[PDB]
Write the structure tokens for this entry.
Amino acid sequence: MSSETVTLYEAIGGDATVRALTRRFYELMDTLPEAARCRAIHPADLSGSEAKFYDYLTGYLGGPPVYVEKHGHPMLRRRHFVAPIGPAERDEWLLCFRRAMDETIENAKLREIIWAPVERLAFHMQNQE
Ligand code: HEM
């Protein structure tokens, strides 16, 4: 929606915010020693991962459906099956996503709206242990 209601994308500040969110996420993943397990299973060059997550989040939050346009149906559990994701990879991903959100999305109510379903998805991507 845009006029009396608005989308989450609109609400958090749209493209500049999703850009900052996704950038800060991979930065924390690359620089925090506590995120080393999650970092270990990602590609040595994070550039392509960032592009895809940014496109995924853009569509997911009510912005333009750019991820689907390029890659088709998300099918995330299947796409994540190629990485070995145990509790550690899972909680370290959630560590970085939480901190990236807290730092880039000012509105607490919008962070709560986004977080609960993402944390559900993360537990659902876990494929080990
Ligand atoms: C358990 C937590 C998670 C871990 C450890 C994890 C890890 C990974 C890894 C290793 C990749 C492959 C990177 C690449 O191809 O460059 C990936 C891709 C991706 N992840 Fe996750 N992920 C997790 C949860 C999530 C969640 C909850 C979402 C959605 C909010 C998500 C969205 C994506 C997307 C859109 C891709 C690109 C898929 C594609 O290849 O088209 N991930 N993730």
